[model samples]
Target: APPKTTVRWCTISSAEEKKCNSLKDHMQQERVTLSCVQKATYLDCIKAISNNEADAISLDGGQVFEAGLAPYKLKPIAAEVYERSGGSTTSYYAVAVVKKGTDFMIKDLRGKTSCHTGLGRSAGWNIPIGTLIHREDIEWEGIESGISEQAVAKFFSASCVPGATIEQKLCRQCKGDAKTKCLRNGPYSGYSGAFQCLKDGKGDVAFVKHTTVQENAPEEKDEYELLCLDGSRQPVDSYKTCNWARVAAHAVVARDDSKIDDIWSFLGMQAYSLGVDTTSDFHLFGPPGKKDPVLKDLLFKDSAIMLKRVPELMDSQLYLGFEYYSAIQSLRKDQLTVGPRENKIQWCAVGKDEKSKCDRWSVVSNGEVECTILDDNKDCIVKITKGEADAISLDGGFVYTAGVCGLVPVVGESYEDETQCSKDEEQPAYYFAVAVVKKSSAITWNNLQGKKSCHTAVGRTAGWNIPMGLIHNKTGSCDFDDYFSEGCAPGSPPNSRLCKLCQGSGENLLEKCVASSHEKYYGYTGALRCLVEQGDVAFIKHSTVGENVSGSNKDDWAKGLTRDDFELLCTNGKRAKTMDYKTCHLAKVPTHAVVARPEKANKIRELLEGQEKLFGLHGTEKERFMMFQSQTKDLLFKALTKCLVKLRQGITYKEFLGDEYYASVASLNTCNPSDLLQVCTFLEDK
Candidate 1:
């Protein structure tokens, strides 16, 4: 079938309509028919494209995502390219600029006036607001139930955020009003407008693109500085080193099934004719008309070097990347419901002790955090799944469980250990899973038939899954009870031989094999205690021995022993001292992570990172209140965690656990682990 001759372009304003008509006339002279379809706004253009009333429209990155949503399956056909560092890129940096000698950082923006290009714009509003709200330095107050715009209005003292006049508070700092003083019509509207706001002393800081200050006011380049994430200041030109985030440039979108071939050809010709190199009679890339010299570029960015063709399947989210997409999405949501409203993080704690400690942390932070008690880690996962709890830190094995239940790992706990890490570089967050045995034990890996063992729990990664998986593969049997001389694998049934080594509580003997702190020989410490007194070997995570038996820990079972009394069993039928664990440990498992429902992952991360700064190991209130306590055993969160890092988007449990370990865990499950797992597996395959 032949493609359409006339390409209809959507325009947002009279100036844009005029520019579109000029481009159409230039295309007509080049033997191509073009038409201009006027729309009331950018959103109207999106609707026009979806309804086939318009063939194409150039849109901001945020609008592109909106256009790609259901009902409007439009895809970006081309992207505007911009010059950067002697090369061209389809992305631009969103930067926060302040006057030189300013004594404030990005985190110190609270109560200070701010300048934005306009509401709903990518660089000006979404990027900056999204970046600021997640920061611990900013104070979120009086913004209990609105979106990022409202949060910003409360965050700043007052300033120009053009085009947000619907809310008077947002326009309190602006020089113009709703009728004729905002955005395009206002004095402080676009890239130049934000810079103008700062230049006029209307705002203490300006949020705009990196090229904004240089392009708008070249002579005053030395007057501006950028705010970095580390709270340092750098020259504006060094935005590559100090910027809020990188965002995609505007995209020329069209209906997926439109006459894409003709559109590209027509656009290619028009670009060359009216581009910076061309001598065309019509100025398609210039100002709309001579009357409005302040209004620089009409339909496209004036600084665009060229337009490049995009793939047919490159939707807005894929084109913009996950980090930038998340920033925009976070800005659109209600702040209070997300994580900023109560100024508190709803931490999911599993046991009464954990909840009790959480209460202390909350009190110390002055209600900056709260607790939701669950009986076990699985219950915590279920509560997160049901949206009853905001977040819970889980071990690698349970991370997989939570991931399969439609939850995401927001941040991972990184540990600092001198044994396996360099002083300069970032230390690996992973810990080795090792089998600990007393120095007097005579068991070797090759001859471990009928030796009693102690495990942290039944489904734990280091304690049970990894060790049991290795034994199952070695013996070619899943019947671990028959293979080993009765072990203490907590969570096992009372009648099972796995529960033989467990010493039941004073109240109930059967409670000995349960998966609670009440179990005398349940967790890592319990497993170590089991080996020290009753069992031949204990399977647990690395650092468990050093943290417990050393002089630092005053627990009854751990106080008597020294680091020299224990040895690690290697898979190669060798033993090494506790200090030499790097050479003799079993598998290195993934770090524990804070998991939440996917929708709440970002908010959970924000709250946790902020709380960690207040009550974590080296936190300000460490002496008074400790969120991660070293002496009382790791309760709600791990004590060894140095910091939390964000995981890549769309990462799944299967990917995180690796194929071999995932399959190993799956093989160990006699029945489905959870209904969520079955559904997740089905969805992934489908």
Candidate 2:
């Protein structure tokens, strides 16, 4: 039960905690009661408040979306107010800032290195990301599927999306050192940090508030320009016209069960006595008279002019207007599932499409597997560590990361022979990467230079490393992009010729080359599809051709296709039948697995086994909804995934992946490292 005496204010940092403590002391003097509770991060704060360990915390719109979701059920009880030209208001404009010398307009933001105030902040993430989503640059389904952050990451060349702490590329430009680097308290965070990230030339653009540019570069008018929606740049002061969206101000959020009058009474009393105009011991708006040692915006934003109680009817979605609420939902639609999820096994679905399947599975399986969402496999791993999620199926490379981050294998996937699942001896835990080509093409492995190629993704093991690594050794060069005349590698540079053959998620053409299902040419099936549609060669699994061809598949694209029409490009400079992969293939890599906490592993295994029995290849409910099938290609599980086999007792990632394959994954990781890997490595160091 929640405490009845004092309202506990949850703080995300020591700076905020100290300020919270001061407020707690002051409130006691007013014949009211208060207390302070500190959590490691704002997400943790939300969890604490949700679990009834804390009472209240102020949140921006994006975080409010997270808090108000399902278990938290938080609502805005009060709004922070600021002065406007005419009167006071509880909203501000989100604007994009670029240096004067950059010629590209806001419409051409695809390839630019951008800076943001922070992840989950109004002006930085929700407003600008919402703007780009509305403009159709990022796919709506991609967001709804819970990959909003990744789509944003792919849209920009690089970014300082502080609070997206797991993804390293988002934090590469951060000025902080060690793990503290890129955290909320770090240098490249909040309004000033975002402006500095752009000003110091680390980023080409900054997504911040209408006032940030002016506040940071007060006298340097010619140094920056605000980017407008219509492909134009304007003076900094033209934010009323150039801004992305007028977003709701940060508000004090509490459990829906909290007494609103008492909370508002405490805030109203403080504002009347210590507000900006009052001569009191404490000032409500900005920081103290002493110095800049303590962080500002503790109990409230320093920019806030005053506090105003919200309407009795005010809630998270209501305060965030319809247009704004819709934008946030598009990014979290996959996450709309509700629960008292602490006791349940939360199965992390990677995308909105995947979530739909998982959601159906949850229903059919009697809620044994509750569905949650993340942007990617790595995100699932990160969430698992933080207790935001419990489990997810992951690729071999991602499993390696899951291992580094302290997760254990609950079940391993086995494809092709169904007998492999029943094998007593060591099962074939690996798949062959094959260089596939059309029977009509006269291309050989040696003479295939300058031909168009289809690859699953840029950093993938089989699709990229094995094939491209072989080519790099043969040519003794690293110009892989130049080797292919034009091709599709989902994670390639936005403007490079490598992305020429790509298609975005259906309607959103601007989502080209994204390394997720949002990009049409994204996975092994996608690469095979690319080969059939346009490309000459496809670097994919040997199973890709057989799985999708032979008229065995019912998909329209593979309707009339047969395995006889495809051949493998052997390294011996000869072509062989698609089934000859044992003699003609690139590299053999470990298969994928579903990971979870050590103690929860058996529970997860039992739950998945339960679900699969009802939805497997010969399940009772197969006609209702094929657990593995999506309208398109793979989603929750690969279309080719035969079954999830039980792994050895207490198997670790290294044990499952083995040394040889694990070594290669590390090589691909270190060159231009992933931030998730960096975070895991950072944790190991500690």
lDDT for each residue of candidate 2 in 1-686, tens digit (9 for 90 to 100): 22236677788878778877777776576544778888878888888888888878888767877787787788877777766578777788888899998799877888788888888788888777877876878655553444455676677777888887568778777777878767876767777678778878989988888767555656786788989998888999888888888878888888888666666767777888778877766776763332332365667877788876665444565567555776676555654434424556988887677777788878877777788987666567766775567888877767877787678887877774355664632553688879999877579999888899999887676778777767776776657788989999986887887899998786375587777788778889889889988888899988888888887667777788998879898898888899887788887888878898676788788877776777866667888767766666778777766677888779888888888887776655554456566555533311
**What TM-score would each prediction reach against the true structure?**
0.49, 0.50
List ranges where model 1 is wrong by over 4 Å: 1-4, 137-148, 175-178, 183-185, 280-293, 334-686
For each candidate in turn, give its C-alpha RMSD to the true structure in angstroms.
15.1, 23.7
**Tens digits of per-residue lDDT for model 1 on 563-676?**
888998889998888888678887877777777777677677667667777776667867887666634567776776666666666666666666766787777654334443
Best-matching candidate per lDDT: 2
Which TM-score value belongs to model 1?
A: 0.49
Where does candidate 2 stray beyond 4 Å?
1-341, 422-425, 472-482, 507-510, 554-556
Clashing pairs in 1: 181-186
Q: Highest TM-score: give the candidate number.
A: 2
lDDT of each: 0.73, 0.76
